[PDB]
Design a protein around this ligand. Sequence first.
Ligand SMILES: [Zn+2]
Length: 260
Amino acid sequence: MSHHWGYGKHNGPEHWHKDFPIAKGERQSPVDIDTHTAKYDPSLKPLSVSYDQATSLRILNNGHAFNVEFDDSQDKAVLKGGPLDGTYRLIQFHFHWGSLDGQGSEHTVDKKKYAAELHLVHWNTKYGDFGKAVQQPDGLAVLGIFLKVGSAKPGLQKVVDVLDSIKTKGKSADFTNFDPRGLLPESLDYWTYPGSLTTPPLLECVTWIVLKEPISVSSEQVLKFRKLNFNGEGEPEELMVDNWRPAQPLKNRQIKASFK
Ligand SMILES: [Zn+2]
């Protein structure tokens, strides 16, 4: 249908509440991280990211972003520790980005926007599969990583290089042997809060873990994101930029951190 959700003026974040009333709920994401009001919790443990046996499959343009999909049939790529009481399996990653380097991230830090934000999405092994997990308040754990512009990120290059092949909605490419360790910063210091999916259906099923340290990507690398299209092949060109939801009200949730 013509007014399927998206990021345009007619179908974007300001409109989502009409089909998805939880958009105005109590635990929506993303949020602004005010570093004066976030609370250092010395009891927060280190994150445990185990990606050395991750098995990537394919990369696809779904008309909203591009997703790299993983084999989540075993404990090959798991997130645990940190604020988490369970183990979560990686199913996909994707990014959100802007029409210029000055915006594109979903989370903000003291109102500062980054050029992009990477989401690694993981689901809780208590629940059987992803579809079941998103119905539970502790169903998902999303690791959020900001992108700033500087030096190139070597581990991102395979992704950048393939994007020309999946320009339009519905296109995919094989994408094997991709190592998601190559997308992580040196430090795993983090903020965490309870929240939601940032796209429809906006379900309030996510433990967010947002890394303090951005990764650096080159200007050339993030520029390639902006060549993707929201549209299908043959349809009028609608460039895939500004596929981010703005910050939502915190509503008395506590953001906790592993540092001051
Ligand atoms: Zn996302």
